[PDB]
């Protein structure tokens, strides 16, 4: 069931520079990366390559960093999260960054469940880890089904055997995987549909 809480939320406004853009984000203690832009997310956002005609999906968007940082560079952006507070903040953050003139939507979704109304050129995500490898594998396998031909899925994951195990699975599923960057213990992995 759904319920509207009585409890207050802790909010912290954070500014950062991503892809050379000066952005501002309202963050909340009940949402991932409260009070600062996550290092993994920053590395992913700086390294992802997008095309002006791409329809992209920011999976597990939190307060919206990835979608917001890329919105003006692509054709359309869908940000999705299961956390309702996250959804609210991402919508508010679209306004804080003057992106109202772009095709951006924020959708409540348990993984891909509510965003399968279109196909995407890119699926970009900083996936949850404590949730376990089964959820990680699902992000990869179901992701392939939602990508347009030549589409790509981009993930950031903390290095060593974790990134290696996931890369192996991505190669299993897609028939290819590439390490785009390794920085400060984080790896950005990319697989293409084809």
Swiss-Prot record:
Its EC number is 2.1.1.-. S-adenosyl-L-methionine binds at residues 60-64, 81, 126. Coiled coil: none annotated. Keywords: Methyltransferase, S-adenosyl-L-methionine, Transferase. It holds the Pfam family MTS. The keyword GTP-binding does not apply. InterPro entries: RsmC/RlmG (IPR046977), SAM-dependent_MTases_sf (IPR029063), Small_mtfrase_dom (IPR007848). It comes from the Archaea. CDD domains: AdoMet_MTases. Gene3D superfamilies: Vaccinia Virus protein VP39 (3.40.50.150). One of its GO terms (biological process) is rRNA base methylation. One of its GO terms (molecular function) is rRNA (guanine-N2-)-methyltransferase activity. Substrate binds at residues 126-129. It is an enzyme of class 2 (transferase). Belongs to the methyltransferase superfamily. Probable methyltransferase that uses S-adenosylmethionine as the methyl donor. Binds neither NAD nor NADP in vitro. PANTHER family: RIBOSOMAL RNA SMALL SUBUNIT METHYLTRANSFERASE C. This is Probable S-adenosylmethionine-dependent methyltransferase MJ0882. It comes from Methanocaldococcus jannaschii (strain ATCC 43067 / DSM 2661 / JAL-1 / JCM 10045 / NBRC 100440) (Methanococcus jannaschii). The lineage of its organism: Archaea, Methanobacteriati, Methanobacteriota, Methanomada group, Methanococci.
């Amino acid at each position: 069931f759904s319920e509207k809480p009585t409890t207050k939320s802790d909010v912290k406004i954070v500014e950062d520079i991503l892809r050379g853009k000066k952005l501002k984000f309202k963050t909340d203690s009940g949402v991932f990366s409260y009070g600062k832009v996550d290092k993994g997310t920053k590395i992913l956002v700086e390294n992802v390559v997008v095309d002006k005609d791409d329809d992209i999906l920011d999976l597990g968007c939190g307060y919206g960093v990835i979608g917001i940082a890329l919105a003006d560079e692509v054709k359309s952006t869908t940000m999705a999260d299961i956390n309702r507070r996250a959804i609210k903040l991402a919508k508010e953050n679209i306004k804080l960054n003057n992106l109202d003139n772009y095709d951006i939507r924020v959708v409540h979704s348990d993984l891909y469940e509510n965003v399968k109304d279109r196909k995407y050129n890119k699926i970009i995500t900083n996936p949850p880890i404590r949730a376990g490898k089964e959820v990680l594998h699902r992000i990869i396998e179901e992701g392939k089904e939602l990508l347009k031909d030549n589409g790509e899925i981009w993930v950031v994951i903390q290095t060593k055997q974790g990134a290696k195990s996931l890369a192996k699975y991505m190669k299993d599923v897609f028939g290819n995987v590439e390490t785009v960057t390794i920085k400060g213990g984080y790896r950005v992995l990319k697989s293409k549909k084809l």
